Structure 1
Amino acid sequence: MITKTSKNAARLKRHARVRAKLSGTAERPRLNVFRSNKHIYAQIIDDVNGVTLASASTLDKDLNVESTGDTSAATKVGELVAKRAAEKGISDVVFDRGGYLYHGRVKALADAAREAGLKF
Structure 2
Amino acid sequence: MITKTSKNAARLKRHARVRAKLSGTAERPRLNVFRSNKHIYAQIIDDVNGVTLASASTLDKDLNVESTGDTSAATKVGELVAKRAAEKGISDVVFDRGGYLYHGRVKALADAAREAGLKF
TM-score under structure 1 normalisation?
Answer: 0.98
Q: SS of 1:42's equivalent?
A: strand
TM-align CA RMSD: 0.6
Q: SS of 1:59's equivalent?
A: coil
Q: CA deviation at 1:62?
A: 2.3
Partner Cα distance (1:24, 1:41) in 2: 17
Partner Cα distance (1:13, 1:56) in 2: 24
Could you say which residue in structure 2 is the equivalent of 1:60?
60
Partner Cα distance (2:75, 2:107) in 1: 9
Aligned length: 120
Could you say which residue in structure 1 is the equivalent of 2:26?
26
Q: CA deviation at 1:91?
A: 1.0
Gaps of 5+ in 1: none
Q: CA deviation at 1:59?
A: 1.1
Partner Cα distance (2:30, 2:109) in 1: 14
Alignment deviations for residues 46-97 of structure 1 (CA, whole Å, 9 cap, x no partner): 0001001001101112221010110000000000010000000111100001
Matched ranges for 1:7-86 at <5 A: 7-86=7-86
Partner Cα distance (1:61, 1:37) in 2: 18
Partner Cα distance (1:76, 1:63) in 2: 8
Q: SS of 2:85's equivalent?
A: helix
Gaps of 5+ in 2: none
Partner Cα distance (1:92, 1:62) in 2: 25
C-alpha contact 1:77 1:109 (8 A) present in aligned 2: yes
- Runs of 4+ aligned residues of structure 1 deviating over 2 Å after TM superposition are none
Q: CA deviation at 1:28?
A: 0.2
C-alpha contact 1:63 1:80 (8 A) present in aligned 2: no
Q: CA deviation at 1:102?
A: 0.6
Q: SS of 2:95's equivalent?
A: coil
